[PDB]
Symmetry: D3
Subunit: 287 residues, 6 copies
C-alpha cells in the first residue's frame, strides 16, 4: 500500500491546459516585494495545488462532465476518489506552508481558508435552495470566494518579504479583493453574452430585482432547477429576457468601475514604490 489512487486524480488535473493567472499575479507582486526565487517557487506551488483542489471540488458540485474541453476528474476516477484526493491536497498544502519557515504563515492560511469556505457555503446554499441573493450579498460572497486565494498569496508574500515593506499590505489586499470581484464578474459576463446548474450571476440579480413581476424568467429558472438543465431554446429565451432589463449593460458599468479601481490602486502603489511595474500592467491588458 503506497500512494496512487490518491495522487492520480491530483495528477490528472495538473496535466491540463491552464492560463496561469495566479502564478503571473505572484510574479507581478514580486516586483514590488522582491523575494528569492526559491520562496517564489514555493508560493507558486502552494497556489497551484490550492487552485487544483478547488477546481476538483467545484466540478463535482456542478455536475459538469467536461473541463477545458477534456473529461473531468470525477468522470475518470469516480466522485468518492476525487473527493478523497481533494481532501488530501489540503493536508499536503499545510506541509508546504510549514516549510516557509514562519509561524505566522499558518495563522493566515487557517484564517482565510475559513473565509473561502464561508463564501462557498453561501454559494452552495443559494444554488440548492434557489434563493436569489441581493447585490450586496452576492458581491460580498464573491469577494470572499474568488478573492480568497489572492488574499492568501498577498498576505503570505508581505510576510516573507524582507522587513521594510509591511505597510503595503492594506493597498495590496484591497487590490486582491477588487481583482477577485473583477474576475468573477468577467466570467459571469463571458458565460452569458457569448444557468443549467441554476447558478446565480450579476446579470441575473439585476433582472430579478428590477422586474419583481416577471413570472416568465422565474419559471425558466425553476424548469432548470427541476429538469436539471436548460435546452438551447430556453437558454435563448433567458438570454433575451436579460437584454430587455438592461442587465448586459449594468454588468458593463460594474466592469468599468472595477477596472478604474484597479488602475487607480496600481498607480497609487507605483507612485509609492517607484519605477513602473510593467508586469501587473500586462495581466490587466489581458483582463
Amino acid at each position: 500500500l503506497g500512494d496512487e489512487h490518491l495522487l492520480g486524480p491530483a495528477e490528472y488535473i495538473s496535466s491540463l491546459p491552464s492560463k496561469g493567472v495566479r502564478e503571473a499575479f505572484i510574479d507581478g507582486l514580486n516586483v514590488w516585494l522582491v523575494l528569492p526565487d526559491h520562496r517564489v517557487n514555493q508560493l507558486k506551488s502552494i497556489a497551484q495545488t490550492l487552485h487544483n483542489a478547488s477546481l476538483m471540488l467545484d466540478d463535482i458540485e456542478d455536475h459538469s462532465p467536461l473541463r477545458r474541453g477534456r473529461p473531468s476528474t470525477h468522470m475518470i476516477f469516480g466522485t468518492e476518489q476525487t473527493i478523497n484526493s481533494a481532501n488530501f491536497l489540503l493536508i499536503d498544502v499545510m506541509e508546504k506552508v510549514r516549510q516557509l519557515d514562519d509561524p505566522r504563515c499558518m495563522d493566515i492560511y487557517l484564517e482565510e481558508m475559513r473565509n473561502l469556505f464561508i463564501g462557498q457555503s453561501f454559494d452552495l446554499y443559494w444554488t440548492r435552495n434557489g434563493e436569489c441573493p441581493s447585490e450586496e450579498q452576492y458581491l460580498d460572497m464573491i469577494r470572499q470566494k474568488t478573492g480568497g486565494l489572492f488574499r492568501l498569496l498577498t498576505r503570505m508574500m508581505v510576510q516573507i518579504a524582507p522587513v521594510q515593506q509591511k505597510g503595503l499590505e492594506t493597498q495590496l489586499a484591497s487590490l486582491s479583493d477588487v481583482l477577485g470581484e473583477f474576475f468573477q464578474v468577467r466570467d459571469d459576463y463571458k458565460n452569458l453574452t457569448e444557468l443549467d446548474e441554476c447558478k446565480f450571476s450579476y446579470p441575473l440579480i439585476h433582472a430579478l430585482t428590477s422586474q419583481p413581476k416577471n413570472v416568465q424568467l422565474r419559471g425558466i429558472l425553476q424548469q432548470s432547477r427541476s429538469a436539471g438543465g436548460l435546452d438551447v431554446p430556453l437558454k435563448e429565451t433567458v438570454l433575451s429576457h436579460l437584454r430587455q432589463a438592461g442587465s448586459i449593460e449594468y454588468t458593463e458599468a460594474k466592469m468599468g468601475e472595477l477596472m478604474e479601481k484597479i488602475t487607480d490602486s496600481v498607480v497609487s502603489l507605483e507612485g509609492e514604490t517607484g519605477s513602473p511595474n510593467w508586469v501587473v500592467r500586462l495581466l490587466i491588458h489581458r483582463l
Copy 2:
C-alpha cells in the same frame, strides 16, 4: 489590400549583378523612415542597462548601409516599425547571455505589451514562434554531431529564427493567413531559411571562430564552416568559397522555387504571391546589412559610433452540528496528563470522527444513521462535502493549541496514512477488485487504526516526560485494536453487500473457492443493479456458511483479542 506599397521604400542601386558573390538577381531596398528604426533599438539599450546590466557586443545599428530591419524588412508599415526593431535588439542580446530575474521579466513584459496593444490577432501568432524557437534551441544538444548537410539544415532553420522573422514580417505587413496555405508553403520557403542561415554562418564565422579559438571548452559548434570540417576536411578560406557555393545554390534555390507556387496559384492568388514575393526580399537584405555590420566587425565599432552619434458561519457549521448531535457510542474518547489537555484531545478525536462519518455516509449512499436521517439528506451532498473539508482545517487549529511543534507532523503523517488507506478501499469497492487477505488487513490498519495511532502518538508527546519506551508498544496495540474493530464490524454485519463492500469472510469465500460462479454473479448483480434484495442476501449467506468462511472469521477475532 494585398499589394505591396512601393512608396514606403526605394530601390538601392548596385553596379554588380551579385553582392560580394551573393544574391545575383535580387533587388535591394531601404525604407523611407530610418529615423524611426534607430529609435527603437536605442530604447532597448537604455532599458537593458537600467534593468539588467551593461552591454558590449553591438547590435542591429549600422550607419553606412542601414538598420537590420530596414534592409531586411523594407515594406513594413510606418506605425508598426519602432516596435518591430525593438524586438530585434532584444533578440540579439538575449541570445548573447543564453535583480536579474526582475529586469528580465519586466523587459519581457514592456515589449510584449507594445505588441499586444497594436494588433491583438497577429501578435498572438508571433509569440508562439518565439516560444518554439527558445524551446527548440534549449532542448537540442549543442554537442550533437551532424552527419550531412540536410540534417544540419533542419536544425538551422529553427535556430536562426527565419520563421520567427517571417512571423515578424507578416505583422509588419498586416498579412494574416490560414492553416491550409501553411502546409502548401513550407517546402517552398524551406530553401530560403537555409539560405538565410548559411549566410549568417558564413558571415558571422570570423568573429564566431575568434570566439571559438578564445573558448577552449568548445564541443561541436553549430556552424556550417566548422561542421563541413567533419565531411570534407580542408582549409577554412578555401571552405569559405565552398560555403559560398553551397549557399549560392540556395540563393537561386528559393529564387527559382517560387515557380512551384507560381505554376500552381502564382498567377491568381495575389495574397500568397505578394507574401512569397516579399519573402524573396529577405535574402538580399541580410547580406547587405551583414557586409559591414558592427555585430561581426568590432574594429569599426568606435568609428561606427562617430557618425551614428549625430456573511456568517451558519451554512458552514450546519452539517457539523447535526452529525455531532446524533447518539454516539464513543469508543475513541474512552481510548483517551492534565485535564484540559485530555479534553482538547477528546475534542480533536470527536471532530475527526464526525468528519470521517460525514464523508463515509456519502460514499455508501446510506440514507440513515443511528435510525435517524443521514446528513446529506438534511443539508445536501455538496454542503456536507464543504463542511467535511473545513472540519479538517478546524481540527488543524485545535492541534496547534496543544502547544508542541511535533504534534503538527504527527497529525500530518497520520492523516496521509488515513487517506492512503481510504483510497485503496474506494478503489477496491468501485473497480470490482477482490483484494488479498494481506492487502485487506493492511488497508484496515490505516483506515481504521489511523485515528487510534494519531491520538496515541499525540498523547505520548504531550505526556509529562516519565514514560519513555511506551511508544512502540502502544502503537502496536492501537493497530491491532483497529483491526479487531474492523473485523468485528465485518462479522456483525452478516451473521446478525448493498454497496459492494469486500469483507473479511467474503475474501475467504471468493479465494478458497476459485470456481464458484454463483457468488460472483450475485456480487456483480449487486454492482450493476445497485443493491441486493433479501433472497439474494440469504443466498450469499448460505454460500458463506457452506464455504466455512464465517468460522474463519471467528478464528481471526479470537486470535486478534489474544494479541490485545
Copy 3:
C-alpha cells in the same frame, strides 16, 4: 358516442364521499335544492379530479385515483367538460343573475388555485396574510358560490342577509382548510405549505434543518418516514401545532359570532 368523456366523471362520482357540500345546502322548493346539490356535486368532483393530478396521488379514499384508471389527458378533458356541464346545469336554473355569480366565483377560485400552484412549484413560502387570503378563495369559493346562488332564487325577504352568509361561508372554508392542515401532521410529500409550516419558518429565520428537509423533499418527489418525523419534531418544538389550535379556536369563535 360519450363513453370516453363521461367515464372519469362517472368513476369519481361513485367513490364514497363525505357530502359536506350537500349538507351545507332561504325557503327554497325541493327541485331547486336538488339542482343546486347536483351543481355542487359535479363541481367538487371536477375539483378533486384536477387536484389528484396536481399532487401525484395514486390513492383516493383508499381506492385508486381517476388518472390511474383512465389516464391524465382523459381526466383533464373530462374535467373541462365537467365545467361545461356545470354551465349547462346553471342554465337550466333559469335565472339571468346566477350567470354572473357563477362566472365571478369561478374567476376567484381559479385565482386562488393559481397562487397555490405557484407557491408549491417555486418553493416560495407565503406569509400568514397571503395564505389566509388564498384559502378564502380556493376552498371557500364553492360555499360562497352556492350561498350567492341560493339567496337569489329564494323568495324575496331573505335578500339583505347575503353579506352575513357570505362572511360565514368564507370563515367556514378557512376553518376547513386550517383543520385539514392540523389533521395531516398531528395524526409535505408534494411540498405543500401549511399553517404550522408557515409559522415554523417565520418564527425561526435561521432554522436550516427544516429548510433543508423541505428542499430535499422538493427534489425527491416526497419525504420518507424518518424525515417526516424530523419535520414533526421541528414543528412541535417551534410551537406550531399549538399555534394552529389557537387559530382553530378563533375561527370557531367567529363562526359562533357570525
Copy 4:
C-alpha cells in the same frame, strides 16, 4: 390576490407567431353575412381565445417540448399552472359569448363545445390504447375535433347576421365540416411526407388496413409507444412502409376530392347570393 399567475400562460401563448386561419375564415364569412365591425372583432377574440386554449392543452397531452420553434407553455410555467390557466379561458370566453346580446348564442357554444370534447376524448382514447380506428371513425372524429371551432363560429355568426340571411346555414355548416376535414388531412400529409407520440393519421390507417399481416410496421408502432418516441432510422422505415402500400397517393386523392367539394360549395353559395 392578483392575476399575474392566472393570465401568464394565457398571455405567453398569445404573444407567439400565428397563421390566422380562424380569423381569415371569419373575414371571409363576413361577405355573405354582412356584420358590424364591433361584432366581428368580438368573434375574432372569441376564436383566438378558444384556439389558444386548445393549443395550450394539446401540447401537454402530446409531450411536445417546442411549439413553432419556441418553448411551449408548460415548459415555462408548469403543467398544473398551464392546465389551471386553460380551464379559466373557457370561463373567460363564456363571458364574451354573453356580451353578444343573444340567448341563443349560449346554446350554440354549449353544444359545439360538447362535440369538440367528444372528438378529443375519442382521439385521446385511440392514442392511449393503441387501437386503430376505421377510416370512417377517423373521419367522424376530425369533423368535430377540428371542424368544431369553424362550426361554432359559423352558427354564432348567422345568429347576429342582420335579418334576411338565414337560409345559408346548412351550406355554411357543410363548408365548415369539409374545411375541418381538409385542414387535418393536409397536416397529416405535411407531417409525413416532409408518430413520435404514437398518433394515428389518414395515411397510417390505410397501411394498417390494406396490409393486415405487416408485422414490421405494427412493431415499429409499438416501439414508439413503449420507449416514448421513434428515432430517425425508424421514421425512415415507417415512411418506406407507407410508400410501398400506396398510402400517400390515397391521401392525395382524398385531398383532391375534399378541395373539389370546397369549390363546389363555394360556387353554390356565391350562386345563391
Copy 5:
C-alpha cells in the same frame, strides 16, 4: 471450460420442482410397458426441456423470483442465461439420438416447431396489447403447454415394444386436453388464490362480454405503461372480473376438461 455454460443450467435444476412431467412419463408406462433405462432417458429429456423453458420464461416475464428463490438471470445475467438455454436445445439433440430411432428426431423437431409457434403467438399478444378470442387462446395454450406432453407421448409410443401402436391418437388427445387443463388451472389459481400484461381465460370473457367497460381496459393499459400493477388496482380488476361471471365461467371449463380427461382415461382402459 464448460463452467459459464452449464452454470445457469445447474442452478435451475437445483431448485425444488413438482415432478409433473416425470409422473406423466410414469403414467403412460403402464399401458406402453417399456424398459427402465429408456424411461430414465425420456425423463432426462423432459427435465432438460422444462428447465430450458423455465429459464427463458423467467427472462421474458421479468420475474425476480422462482420457487421463492431467486431466478437464474439474477445470478448469472440475462445474456448467459439465454446462452445456456440455447445450448440446452443442442444437448437435448444429443440426448434424443441415444434413443436409437430415426423417427424420434422428426417427432422432436415437429413438436418443437409447434411449441415455438405457440410461444410466438403468446409473445405477440402480450407485447402489442391485443386481446385474443377464446378460440385463438385455446389453440395457443394447446401447443405451448401441451407440446411437451405430446412430444413425450409420441416418443413413448415409438420406443415402446412393438404391438400397441394404434393407441397414439387417443394419447395425443389426452395430452392436449391435459395441457389445456393445466393452463386453465394456472390461470384460475393466479387469479383467485397481470403484472407483465398477460391475457388469461377469465380476462378474455370479461373483455368480450362487456365491449364497453372502459375501467378494466384502462387498468390493463396502466399495467403496460407502468410495467406492473399495485395491490388496489389488482383488487379492482378482481372485482371487475367477478361482476361479469368470469370466475364462474372458468370453473365450468375446468369441469368439462376433467370430464373429458376421465372419459379419455376410461376409454384407454377398454382397449387394454
Copy 6:
C-alpha cells in the same frame, strides 16, 4: 401461422450482408469439388446460422442499429427475437439432416458446443469486467468466430465426393487462422477509425503492458457503470492506446496471421 415466428428471421435475412461465408464455401469447393445442390444447401445452413448469431449478438450487446438500419429487437422486441433465434437453431437441424449423412450431425453438435463455450467466456468477461490474457483471448476467439468456418469445413469434407483423405487438418488450421484474423481485423477497424465494455487485443495489450495505468481502468469502469463512453472519453482511451503502443502490436499480429494464411494456402495448393 408462422408470421410471428419467422418475422425476425426474414427481416434480418433481408438486410444487406457481406457474404464471407458463401465466398469461403465457394473457395473451398474448388479443392473439394462438391455438386452444386450440396453447395447451396451448405450456403443456406451458413446463412441461417450467421443470421441467428447476429440476432442474438445485437440483443446481448445493446446495439440499437445494424448496418445503419434498425436492429431486429427494435422492430419485434427482445422476446420475439430470442424465440425466432431458437427456432432458427432448431431449423438448421432439419437442414443438416437432408445432407444424407449420419456423421454430419455429430460435427454440427460438437462445433455448436464449442461455439457456445466461447460465447459464454466472452459474456462472463464482459459482464464481470475481468481482463483475460492474450492466450485466453486468442483461445476464445478461435472458437466463437472460427466455429462456423470449422463446422462448414468439416461438413464439406464429409460430403466431399470420395478422395479428400489428408485435406482435413490443414483446412481446419486454415479456418482457425481465418477466424482469428477476422476478429483481430474487426478489433483494429473499430478502434482506429468500449460502449458495451468489450475487451480487445489492443485493450488487453494496454492493460497488461501498463500494470499501473489507473486512468484507463477508471475510464473503462465509467463505461461499465454509465453504460457507454461519450466521445472525449473515447479519444482519451485512443490516446492511451497510442501511448502504450497497442496499435502497432495489433498490426504485427495481423501480419503474422496473414503469413500463416498464405503459407497454408500455398501448401494446400501444392498438395492438390
